[PDB]
Design a protein around this ligand. Structure first.
Ligand code: 9UZ
Ligand code: ZN
Length: 105
C-alpha cells in the first residue's frame, strides 16, 4: 500500500512517502465556488499528471499559492491541482483522495 494510481485508468501518480502535512495535516477538506466538496491530500511531488492553463490565485485554498488544474495525463480525469508561487514549500500538489487508488509498488 505505497503508491497512488489514477482510480480511472491506473496511471502512476504519487507515493505515500511524498505526503506533505500543510498546516499540520496532509488531509484538507475544502469547497470550490460551485459548492463541490473535495477531500484533498497534499503531496510534495507527483507524476503522470497534465497541468492545464496558467496559474490563478482566485479562491486559492492555500494562502499565498496559485493553482493550476491537474488532470491525469493518461485519461483526463480531474485528480487535483498543482500549487506554486508560495513559500516553504514553493510548490506542492493537492490531490483528491477518492480519485486515487492505493496499492503495492
Ligand atoms: O476554490 C478553489 C478551486 C480550485 C483550487 C482552489 O484552491 N480553490
Ligand atoms: Zn487516469
Amino acid at each position: 500500500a505505497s503508491i497512488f494510481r489514477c482510480r480511472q485508468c491506473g496511471q502512476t501518480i504519487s507515493r505515500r512517502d511524498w505526503l506533505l502535512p500543510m498546516g499540520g495535516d496532509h488531509e484538507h477538506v475544502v469547497f470550490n465556488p460551485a459548492g463541490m466538496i473535495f477531500r484533498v491530500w497534499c503531496f510534495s511531488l507527483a507524476q503522470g499528471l497534465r497541468l492545464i492553463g496558467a496559474p490563478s490565485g482566485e479562491f486559492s485554498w492555500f494562502k499565498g499559492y496559485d493553482w493550476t488544474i491537474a488532470l491525469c495525463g493518461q485519461c483526463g480525469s480531474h485528480l487535483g491541482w498543482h500549487y506554486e508561487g508560495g513559500s516553504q514549500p514553493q510548490t506542492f500538489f493537492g490531490l483528491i483522495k477518492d480519485r486515487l487508488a492505493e496499492g503495492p509498488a
